[PDB]
Design a protein around this ligand. Sequence first.
Ligand SMILES: NC1=NCc2ccccc21
Lengths: 351, 14
Amino acid sequence: GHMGNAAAAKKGSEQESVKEFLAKAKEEFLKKWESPNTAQLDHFDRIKTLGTGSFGRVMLVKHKETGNHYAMKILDKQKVVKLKQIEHTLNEKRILQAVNFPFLVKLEFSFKDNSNLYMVMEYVPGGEMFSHLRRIGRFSEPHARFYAAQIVLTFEYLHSLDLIYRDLKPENLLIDQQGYIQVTDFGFAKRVKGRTWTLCGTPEYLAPEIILSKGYNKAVDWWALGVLIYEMAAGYPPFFADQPIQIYEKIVSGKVRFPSHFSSDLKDLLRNLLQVDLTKRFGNLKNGVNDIKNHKWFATTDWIAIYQRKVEAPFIPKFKGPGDTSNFDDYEEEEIRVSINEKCGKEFTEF
Amino acid sequence: AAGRTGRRQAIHDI
Ligand SMILES: NC1=NCc2ccccc21
């Protein structure tokens, strides 16, 4: 076979240890999930905007009492107007409260006022994977593999808790001071026991079954991992067009082309992730995540060493001191206005 | 060919 006796038994024992870990992780998650206003706005100095989207923004803030720095996500309650926009915000807070994994950003406080919802997380100063990737062009395959392995482990953890992530992309992956990944932005994450139906995510990363309005499951995250690995190694994603409608047409076609510099092992992995047929997609078969972890392209990956953060990272961002923002792009700064009247109070009772 | 090179916004519905 491909493995000898010593290797096969080591692998089996490793796989049983993963099961033992995930059983304990699920017990710890459920305790926090069943048992979810830990600060207020004037406890923080607002320093700089780190990113902006349609419903709000993330700012670097400094805690006045401790001097610690954090990333604060601010959501305008009125702008969170659409039905799925509201439910998704409650998902995000509750999931972040309850999870614990070395590559998942840690929530510290959440609170709300008359105008806004707030989530205060750990500040990750090395910047988005997105801007390092665009600056250098593409990552070599060992570099891309080091990040991919962290996503595989993070999805194995989330999916074992029945959580789907649903917004993987380089814009949502921050690089910490040791060069490891921190997944942020759980705005699209959801606990799903079987199928779910919301049409959501980012066009280039959508699985075909989402675009086709089919009920779908956690296998959409494994498709998105194929898109991410392709983009990291190529410098552009596999389904690439100026307008979302054109992107959707390419995704549903079933027709990926690869740069001539991709290794054959990489192409084989990507064909099995970017698989339209759900009866054939890696991550979705009887052997689950192990079809990915045991693929030839990951043969050099020490999965436990990645989890334990024992592996030397390919790139360490430069950091000048606490509250350094040099690894982030600049954004227009807008005043944070809090109305004298409560907005949308009944809609956000649970937050 | 041509495609989106800047940051990509997610879509909550549709
Ligand atoms: N997705 C994100 N880009 C920058 C950032 C900072 C903090 C939280 C989320 C993000």
